[PDB]
Amino acid sequence: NLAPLPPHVPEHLVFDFDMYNPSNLSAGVQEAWAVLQESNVPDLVWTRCNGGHWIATRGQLIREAYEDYRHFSSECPFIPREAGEAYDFIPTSMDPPEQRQFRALANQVVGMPVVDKLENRIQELACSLIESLRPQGQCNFTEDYAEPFPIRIFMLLAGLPEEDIPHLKYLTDQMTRPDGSMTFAEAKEALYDYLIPIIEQRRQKPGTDAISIVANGQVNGRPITSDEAKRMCGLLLVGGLDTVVNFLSFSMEFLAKSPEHRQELIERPERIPAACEELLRRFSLVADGRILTSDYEFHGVQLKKGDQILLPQMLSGLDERENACPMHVDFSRQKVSHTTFGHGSHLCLGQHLARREIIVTLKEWLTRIPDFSIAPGAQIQHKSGIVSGVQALPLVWDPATTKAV
Ligand code: MNR
Ligand SMILES: [K+]
Known part of the structure; x- marks a missing residue:
């Protein structure tokens, strides 16, 4: 359904793009969003879909908006408006200066130092899961590795039972790619229903897990409140269950279709870190936004207080003006430009854990x-939303070409 066009929005800037179900989704989700960068499309457009909102389509505008938090606030960062209004995670729903004090605490539980505490366990689990699949000559990558690898690591860090994964993963997905059975607000309340008692129990009897550290932490010298701890832990759950999980499938799908790129990393393994960065650019997947704090003229367009604007962190990297031959994957790319981990004061705090x-x-x-390939006659389907993903990824290979080491 298309919402009525607001009085200040001109017709020539209307482009009815649906972030939850794009028209060209069959060609790939990244390709689907890239239609917003064709020759006849303005730098900033308005879509009547999902309640009506602006969309910045070029890296220059996306970076400018993320830097100017005075005009573009994180208080209501999700579309539709109902979801953005209910959204209250910390630090993501706050603007500086209040936002800053909470970043240090979050860094304590997911920052670089912590990646060092789990170094061996991450390595062990990856090798373990892969060796188990190797002799099979086939797998359903999404459920056999993409989900269990990052998710089990997060549950370990948070001190939560793996048997709770199905419930938590379902709730997290309703906040990014809703199936219609739950609103954002209902999903958020169910997540808090889960966390509330756990936080109280660990404030009474502290442990060394991530929830215990957050719940008993300090914010710029003063005790964190139970409510603040809940709002921060909810964000960590989402990051642990619906970020790397999706990205890994986009990357493996590409490697399955490009033997040449696989051979490059095999023959020259020192290029893997650079390959990671290039894949993060080409298969970017996050797209959230901001809300206007007042009337403001932006790049010749009149914006009104209350208007929502989507800043696809995904779009910066595919912008031809930022990267030549954007759809091409080149591990030797000199200057890999992107905003896959955000831009400005809210730069991703989990990027070190994700890269590892x-x-x-x-x-x-x-x-x-x-050596592996997509299963015979399979047609890989993607899904779009706040965070985009892959519905299923059936892979096959000849065990005779594998190595058990
Ligand atoms: C479990 C931890 C986390 C993991 C894993 C993780 C993994 C990834 C990842 C992996 C492929 C994707 C891409 C990703 C992308 C982002 N991520 Mn990350 N992220 N990420 C956070 C925790 C985590 N992320 C936190 C915390 C913030 C908010 C910081 C702040 O608001 O000041 C954040 C913020 C962000 C933002 C900024 C959003 C904004 O400006 O409103 C983007 C974009
Ligand atoms: K809000």
């Missing part, structure tokens, strides 16, 4: 299964 999970996967998978 991606690099370990690339190295340990190609070491054991260098």
Whole structure:
């Protein structure tokens, strides 16, 4: 359904793009969003879909908006408006200056230092899961590796039982790619229903897990409140269950279709870290936004207080003005430009954990299964939303070409 066009929006800027079900989705989700960068499309357009909102389509505008938090606020960062209004995670729903004090605490539980505490476990789990699949000559990558690898690592860090994964994963997905059975607000309340008692129990009897550290932490010298701890832990759950999980499938799908790129990383393994960055650019998948704090003229367009604007962190990397031959994957790309981990004061705090999970996967998978392909007659389907993903990824290979080491 298309919402009525607001009085200040001119017709020539209307482009009815649906972020939850794009028209050209069959060609690939990244390709689907790239239609917003064709020759006849303005830098900033308005879509009547999902309640009506603006969409920045070029890296220059996306970076400018993320830097100017005075005009573009994180208080209501999700579309539709109902979801953005209910959204209250910390630090993501706050603007500086209040936002800043919470970043240090989050860094304590998912930052670089922590990646060092789980180094061995991450390595062990990756090798373990891959060796188990190797002799099978086939797998359903999404459920056999993409989900269990990053998710089990997060549950370990948070001190939560793996048997709770099905419930938590379902709730997290309703906040990014809703199936219609739950609103954002209902999904968020169910997540908080889960966390509330756990936070109280760990504030009474502290442990060394991520939830215990957040719940008993301090914010710029003063005790964190139960409510603040809940709002921060909810965000961590989403990041642990619906970020790397999706990205890994986009990357493996590409490697399955490009033997040449697989051979490159096999012959020259020192290029894996660079390959990670290039894949993060080409298969970017996050797209959230901001809300206007007042009337404001932006790049010749009149914006009104209350208007929502989607800043596809995904679009910066595919912008031909930022990267030549954007759809082409080149591991030797000199200057890989992108905003896959955000831009400005809210730069991703989990990027170190994410990069380690991606690099370990690339190295340990190609070491054991260098040659693989998409299953016979399979047509890979993608899904779009706040975070985009892959519905299923059936893979096959000849065990005779594999290595058990
Ligand atoms: C479990 C931890 C996390 C993991 C894993 C993780 C993995 C990834 C990842 C992997 C492929 C994707 C791409 C990703 C992308 C992002 N991520 Mn990340 N992220 N990520 C966070 C935790 C995590 N992320 C936190 C915390 C913030 C918010 C910081 C702040 O608001 O000040 C954040 C913020 C962000 C933002 C900024 C959003 C904004 O400006 O409103 C983007 C984009
Ligand atoms: K809000």
